[PDB]
Amino acid sequence: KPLEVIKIEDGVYLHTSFKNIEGYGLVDSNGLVVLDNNQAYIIDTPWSEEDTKLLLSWATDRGYQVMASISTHSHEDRTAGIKLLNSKSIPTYTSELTKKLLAREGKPVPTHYFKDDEFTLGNGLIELYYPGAGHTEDNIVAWLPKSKILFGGCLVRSHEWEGLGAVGDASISSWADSIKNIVSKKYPIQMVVPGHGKVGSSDILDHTIDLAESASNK
Amino acid sequence: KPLEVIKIEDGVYLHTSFKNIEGYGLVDSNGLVVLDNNQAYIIDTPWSEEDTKLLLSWATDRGYQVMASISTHSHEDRTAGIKLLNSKSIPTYTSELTKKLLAREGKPVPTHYFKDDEFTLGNGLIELYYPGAGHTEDNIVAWLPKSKILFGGCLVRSHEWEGLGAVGDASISSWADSIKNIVSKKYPIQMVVPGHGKVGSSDILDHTIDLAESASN
Ligand SMILES: [Zn+2]
Ligand SMILES: [Zn+2]
Ligand SMILES: [Zn+2]
Ligand SMILES: [Zn+2]
Numbered sequence: 001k002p003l004e005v006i007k008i009e010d011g012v013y014l015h016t017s018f019k020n021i022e023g024y025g026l027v028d029s030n031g032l033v034v035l036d037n038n039q040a041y042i043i044d045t046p047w048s049e050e051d052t053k054l055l056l057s058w059a060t061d062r063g064y065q066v067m068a069s070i071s072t073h074s075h076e077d078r079t080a081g082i083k084l085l086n087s088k089s090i091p092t093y094t095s096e097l098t099k100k101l102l103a104r105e106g107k108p109v110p111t112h113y114f115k116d117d118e119f120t121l122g123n124g125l126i127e128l129y130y131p132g133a134g135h136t137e138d139n140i141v142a143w144l145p146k147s148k149i150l151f152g153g154c155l156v157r158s159h160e161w162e163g164l165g166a167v168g169d170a171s172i173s174s175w176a177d178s179i180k181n182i183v184s185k186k187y188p189i190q191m192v193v194p195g196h197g198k199v200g201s202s203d204i205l206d207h208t209i210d211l212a213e214s215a216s217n218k
Numbered sequence: 219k220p221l222e223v224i225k226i227e228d229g230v231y232l233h234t235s236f237k238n239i240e241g242y243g244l245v246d247s248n249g250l251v252v253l254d255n256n257q258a259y260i261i262d263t264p265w266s267e268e269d270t271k272l273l274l275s276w277a278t279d280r281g282y283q284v285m286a287s288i289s290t291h292s293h294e295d296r297t298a299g300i301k302l303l304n305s306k307s308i309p310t311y312t313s314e315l316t317k318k319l320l321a322r323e324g325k326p327v328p329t330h331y332f333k334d335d336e337f338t339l340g341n342g343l344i345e346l347y348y349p350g351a352g353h354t355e356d357n358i359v360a361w362l363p364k365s366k367i368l369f370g371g372c373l374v375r376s377h378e379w380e381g382l383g384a385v386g387d388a389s390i391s392s393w394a395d396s397i398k399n400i401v402s403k404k405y406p407i408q409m410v411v412p413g414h415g416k417v418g419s420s421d422i423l424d425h426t427i428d429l430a431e432s433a434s435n
Contacts, residue, residue, distance in 0.1 A: 021239040022295040023247060023414040025384040029240070077240045154240070166243045196241035
């Protein structure tokens with residue numbers, strides 16, 4: 001099934017892509033579009049180039065100018081659309097580490113990157129933070145101060161999951177500490193958006209800590 | 219992780235391959251190798267070409283001759299290795315319907331196929347039956363008379379699963395009836411092997427009926 005885009009706050013839209021795995025069935029994958037007047041910013045690409053094309057069309061058919069994307073780690077469900085955005089001369093961003101992981105794997109790289117543990121896209125609109133390793137070594141989160149939405153990406157687990165998911169690239173014994181670093185930011189979080197699953201409240205962070213500590217102890 | 223092969227009965231081996239799905243994690247997929255002396259028959263290929271190569275090496279390193287594979291529906295977890303086996307001149311089989319679905323999807327096709335609802339491979343070694351639509355329109359099962367094992371493939375669900383799984387290609391309202399067609403064969407089933415998850419007893423058939431009927435509603 002094709003990309004879905006739904007409004008979740010003023011100037012903030014959830015975009016969701018779908019993929020099938022034989023045996024299990026459909027899995028969903030989330031990113032955001034954030035609007036600033038008529039400027040649009042993409043937080044994580046859709047899971048495929050085709051779905052990325054649909055997202056770009058969503059924006060441009062509304063008269064929005066897509067200013068940039070940021071991807072929150074190197075995996076395909078965050079970065080599949082980087083190549084397409086590059087081809088359209090739309091600035092693409094990741095952390096330095098994410099960029100160099102992509103380069104090492106021979107994948108398309110973003111045209112821009114940031115070096116610090118903190119950075120902003122859209123001149124303050126979107127605050128990025130690297131809290132430490134968890135789902136992957138490079139996962140970052142995004143804080144949207146106006147809508148009070150924390151985009152946790154795949155570092156956070158929604159309530160519908162009772163496991164950490166794909167952990168081949170994970171640092172399980174570091175994961176709880178990394179969530180605690182997010183909590184220490186003292187963001188006035190009203191909503192947390194996971195990379196997979198339904199939007200929830202700040203208790204998603206507590207749930208993720210539980211899952212990480214349980215897995216660590218095994 | 220790589221292919222795993224483990225003995226589940228004299229002359230019957232479970233092969234399991236793994237694929238990662240971002241968001242969910244590790245998923246497993248099962249097939250069988252069935253031996254007649256040193257002649258080996260593969261029920262469903264592994265989930266990738268690479269794991270299929272490992273399965274062939276497993277067999278030949280043991281001095282087995284791989285006679286044929288049979289795939290129990292068109293999906294990639296059943297058929298990923300057909301191309302490789304074709305390239306090695308190892309006969310590959312599906313039902314006629316499964317072959318035609320593969321062709322229509324532009325996927326590699328088997329070199330052999332059977333036309334009726336029943337077919338036997340080896341010398342009475344493996345009995346194939348098409349019970350009707352369920353997981354997919356083309357799903358078949360394989361019955362092993364000697365070991366009394368039913369390979370139900372992805373038409374049956376293991377007890378550790380709470381749902382039917384991927385139903386995009388399914389006929390949910392037909393699924394329970396199709397299981398009942400299997401039951402009507404009155405096979406003296408002592409073990410059921412699912413396409414995904416742990417091997418169990420014949421009660422896997424009842425469990426699958428329960429899931430199908432619940433979903434039908
Ligand atoms: Zn990931
Ligand atoms: Zn993800
Ligand atoms: Zn299937
Ligand atoms: Zn399957």
